[PDB]
């Protein structure tokens, strides 16, 4: 297999997790 193939979902879930996750903190912030 290739590493890139793994980077695809790895970066998609990683980047997305951070983005969406950021809201979890923002909402708490006041």
């Amino acid at each position: 297999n290739i590493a890139k193939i793994i980077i695809g979902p790895l970066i998609f879930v990683f980047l997305f997790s951070v983005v969406i996750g950021s809201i979890y903190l923002f909402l708490r912030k006041r």
Side-chain angles (χ1 to χ4, degrees):
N1 253 293
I2 311 173
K4 292 208 126 272
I5 302 296
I6 312 179
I7 302 162
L10 271 178
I11 298 295
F12 223 81
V13 67
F14 183 76
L15 277 169
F16 193 55
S17 158
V18 180
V19 179
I20 303 302
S22 97
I23 304 169
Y24 199 64
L25 273 292
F26 238 97
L27 261 157
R28 280 279 280 180
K29 210 215 149 97
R30 213 271 197 197

